[PDB]
Design a protein around this ligand. Structure first.
Ligand SMILES: [Zn+2]
Ligand SMILES: [Zn+2]
Lengths: 168, 168
């Protein structure tokens, strides 16, 4: 039943690759969330949040990775694939993951405010939608949560500078 | 509380425009669902399902329309906008609609199998996500449901021809 296509070291490698995607968003002053989609032990799609830069509301890490994975495979179906994402996917991405037919998802830290996999909803395991995704969580959670904390602190600092310049 | 930026005739015009988008998908042998996003009485985004053609799993009508609307406005935020879609948005699109901050959504026929607005979930009015979208349904439902029925019949016919050619 429970599948294990990759060792813990392999999984760690992939999540760290997603964290590197996460760093791209951070550097661009955006929610530091990264994602990588793997097929046969090879990453076929990468993504990071880029809503502000792209001016696209759907441009979350998972969506970018899915588009890349589909392009790579030249198919909207992403069977026998594993998706690694630093933070629990929101409702939109969860729905997208189900539509892509991705059977395996591994995320780092949970998303208590917008989480659609375990937190607010359980879209990837919902029988009505018949999504039967094997979900794993906790992989490098500390790091995934840490870069997010860095983002928020930097955000307050940027907001403080802006407030100062507007004033006088 | 309840807003009415457009008359019933204006709404009908926009849904018919979404039905025209729906016809594009039908012609390409895809789920005939169309969508239009309106701002200040003007359509700023159009979309239709094109998963098979684009090989993109997220390429539903609403997603295509949102990307177009964001591009038009050069902003991921789609405030003071109204989205018209022939069929009740699925979970992915509903989530996307919430992320775009679209305050008004009008759909034709309901989606009893994958509906994320009223059928399976109520994402657009979920307090946890604080989405406070004004939802209207039923606009030209008969037509929206009709073109879908046409799609399924044509699908069976295409499947029958394919079965015949494979055989002998
Ligand atoms: Zn998301
Ligand atoms: Zn959808």
């Amino acid at each position: 039943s429970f599948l294990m296509p990759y060792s813990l070291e392999e999984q760690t490698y992939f999540m760290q690759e997603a964290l590197k995607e996460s760093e791209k968003s951070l550097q661009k002053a955006e929610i530091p969330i990264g994602c990588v989609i793997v097929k046969d032990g090879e990453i076929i799609g990468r993504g990071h949040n880029a809503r502000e830069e792209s001016n696209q509301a759907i441009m979350h890490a998972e969506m970018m990775a899915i588009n890349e994975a589909n392009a790579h495979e030249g198919n909207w179906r992403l069977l026998d694939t594993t998706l690694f994402v630093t933070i629990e996917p929101c409702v939109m991405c969860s729905g997208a993951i189900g539509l892509a037919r991705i059977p395996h998802v591994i995320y780092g830290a949970s998303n208590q405010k917008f989480g659609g996999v375990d937190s607010l909803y359980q879209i990837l395991t919902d029988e009505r939608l018949n999504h039967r995704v094997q979900v794993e969580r906790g992989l490098l959670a500390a790091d995934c949560a840490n870069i997010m904390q860095t983002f928020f602190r930097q955000g307050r600092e940027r907001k403080k500078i802006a407030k100062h310049l507007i004033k006088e």
